Design a protein around this ligand. Structure first.
Ligand code: HEM
Length: 207
């Protein structure tokens, strides 16, 4: 089934992402709220772009039940970043890292091509990770850095009650998607590139 083949085909990359120097230092408590904030600011850039692609693919009629607007992160993230930074200053100050310029360009290509299979790959890499390892990250930021839970909206998924059921249902939606051989191959390849872009976001933050 597709959910299983996704998890399998990216499990090695996921292990490598765990061991990125930036993210490893962050989660062991060696950095601080400033570096978590730098990450969130890059993520607001790529989630803005991802959610434009989502919106395009949802409107085309592809994977509609999977692309639940409730998952949208960008506006919650911006509220988090208002709290973390103390003001709206960050909006004119932030710039995309080179890793983010590549990731955003790919998401804009998927948007304008309305490429349903490529979009579902990027949707799985980001949102199932947020829904799945996100508490771990939200707990670490609270424990090591004292980040207020109100600045971790991104991880809360307001509007979802039973989270484990939602995850189960998300993976059943992936399994039930109609895909040709060419579309499934393209989706799997894109999921590998999604992890590659994410890992390079951390590499660039660590510079
Ligand atoms: C490039 C960065 C990362 C991405 C894109 C990503 C993405 C994902 C995705 C898509 C899943 C769900 C897999 C599935 O059920 O099919 C997941 C699971 C999970 N992630 Fe991540 N993730 C990343 C980094 C991390 C890091 C640094 C941690 C360390 C806290 C972590 C902790 C977890 C955990 C604990 C799971 C449940 C499965 C497992 O242990 O491998 N993730 N992630």
């Amino acid at each position: 089934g597709l959910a299983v083949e996704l998890k399998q085909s990216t499990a090695q990359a996921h292990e490598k992402a765990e061991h990125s120097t930036f993210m490893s230092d962050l989660l062991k408590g060696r950095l601080g709220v400033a570096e978590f904030t730098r990450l969130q600011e890059q993520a607001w850039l790529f989630y803005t772009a991802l959610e434009q692609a989502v919106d395009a693919v949802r409107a085309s009629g592809f994977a509609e039940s999977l692309l639940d607007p409730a998952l949208n992160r960008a506006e919650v993230l911006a509220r988090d970043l208002d709290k973390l930074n103390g003001s709206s200053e960050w909006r004119s100050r932030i710039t995309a890292s080179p890793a983010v310029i590549d990731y955003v360009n790919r998401l804009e290509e998927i948007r304008d091509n309305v490429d349903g299979p490529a979009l579902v790959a990027h949707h799985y890499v980001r949102y199932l990770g947020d829904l799945s390892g996100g508490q771990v990250i939200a707990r670490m930021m609270q424990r090591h850095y004292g980040v207020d839970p109100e600045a971790l909206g991104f991880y809360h998924f307001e509007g979802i009650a039973k989270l484990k059921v939602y995850k189960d249902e998300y993976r059943e939606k992936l399994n039930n998607l109609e895909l040709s051989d060419e579309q499934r191959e393209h989706l799997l390849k894109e999921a590998t590139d999604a992890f590659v872009f994410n890992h390079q976001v951390f590499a660039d933050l660590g510079k």
